[PDB]
Amino acid sequence: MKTAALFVSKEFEEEAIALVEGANYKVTSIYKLPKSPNVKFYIQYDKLQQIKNDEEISTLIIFEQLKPRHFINIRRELKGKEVLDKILLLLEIFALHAGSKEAKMQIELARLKYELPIIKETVESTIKFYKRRINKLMKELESIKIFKEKSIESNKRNNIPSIGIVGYTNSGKTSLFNSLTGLTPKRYAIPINNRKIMLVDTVGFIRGIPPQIVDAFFVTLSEAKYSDALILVIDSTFSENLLIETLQSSFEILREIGVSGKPILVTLNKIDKINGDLYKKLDLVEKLSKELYSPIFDVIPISALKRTNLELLRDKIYQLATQLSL
Ligand SMILES: Nc1nc2c(ncn2[C@@H]2O[C@H](COP(=O)(O)OP(=O)(O)O)[C@@H](O)[C@H]2O)c(=O)[nH]1
Ligand SMILES: [Mg+2]
Numbered sequence: 001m002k003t004a005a006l007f008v009s010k011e012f013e014e015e016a017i018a019l020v021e022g023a024n025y026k027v028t029s030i031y032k033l034p035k036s037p038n039v040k041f042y043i044q045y046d047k048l049q050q051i052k053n054d055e056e057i058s059t060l061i062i063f064e065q066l067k068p069r070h071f072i073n074i075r076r077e078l079k080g081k082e083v084l085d086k087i088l089l090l091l092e093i094f095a096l097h098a099g100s101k102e103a104k105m106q107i108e109l110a111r112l113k114y115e116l117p118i119i120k121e122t123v124e125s126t127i128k129f130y131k132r133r134i135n136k137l138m139k140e141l142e143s144i145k146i147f148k149e150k151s152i153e154s155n156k157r158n159n160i161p162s163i164g165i166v167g168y169t170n171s172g173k174t175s176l177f178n179s180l181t182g183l184t185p186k187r188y189a190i191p192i193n194n195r196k197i198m199l200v201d202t203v204g205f206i207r208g209i210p211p212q213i214v215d216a217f218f219v220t221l222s223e224a225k226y227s228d229a230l231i232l233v234i235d236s237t238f239s240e241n242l243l244i245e246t247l248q249s250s251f252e253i254l255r256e257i258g259v260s261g262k263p264i265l266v267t268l269n270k271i272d273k274i275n276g277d278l279y280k281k282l283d284l285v286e287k288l289s290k291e292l293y294s295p296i297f298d299v300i301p302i303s304a305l306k307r308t309n310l311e312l313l314r315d316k317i318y319q320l321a322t323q324l325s326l
Helices: 013-022 045-053 068-077 086-097 101-121 124-149 173-180 211-226 240-256 278-292 310-324
Strands: 003-008 026-032 059-062 082-084 162-166 187-192 195-201 229-235 264-269 296-301
Touching: 003 013, 013 026, 013 086, 013 173, 045 068, 068 082, 068 101, 082 086, 086 101, 086 211, 101 124, 101 211, 162 173, 162 310, 173 195, 173 229, 173 264, 173 310, 187 310, 195 310, 229 240, 229 310, 240 278, 264 278, 264 310, 278 296, 296 310
Parallel strands: 003 026, 003 059, 059 082, 162 195, 162 229, 229 264, 264 296
Antiparallel strands: 187 195
């Protein structure tokens, strides 16, 4: 519920908002980055000050990658209030979604490795500790990896079919999970007809993921593979070219994280932003999906926001669930 001040470029503004709300922050104020970052505080001094003194702000979030000296300084000027850069932001998101100890360990590891430098710039006892913890985590992860190869695909069952909602950020993953579970988190079981179905708002596909935290991301996302079905959300407001990119990228990642032979209901979302190109885009998405993956359960136009084609969606989801109930 924490309130946040977002600093971002116009280019990635709608990107950051979606991600910040993903991280359970209320974006109370946004600020455009200044092109040339402050040598001390990265952002603007005056703007940093207003934030220092605005009691309505628990957290300062900067959708860029700050260097150690930036954190050091911004932290000084913001005693008590937390500052997140892009790395820490995504990491907080992963934490909100990671259920597996392995994924949790990847996140801890990366956070430690991200603090290590900030602390190293400047205590020895702390450094020594970070080192010892980083090593322990790697050994833990290393032994999990070994366990996996020396074990068989267990993959427990579930009382209720669980359907993970996947897709790029700002595609509408959350909006859809919300309208489907009539809320306003993470996992929720909903009754469609005489059958109950577990829904999961999954961690999305994420653009420009920094090297530091790719492992954390991959493992977090891979948890989706233990779903019975997946609803792939897609932003209909993309031009055909970008639309092709998204589809290509989506199924690339899905094959990457080991999704196979899993029914996928593709939803083309945001159709209330009508440009007159529905049919065109809908046929494009459907053809290309078929070409890239199987089994494609169905491809359907929707508006998570306006709830325009909700009944049919619930029908497809029901039919899908019924299909998986045996
Ligand atoms: N017009 C329209 N906007 C939508 C729709 N679904 C989501 N949005 C908006 O798109 C932005 C991203 O939504 P979000 O659920 O956070 O996307 P996510 O990052 O994939 O989970 C939000 O600000 C929504 O209000 C839709 O069906 N129609
Ligand atoms: Mg989200």
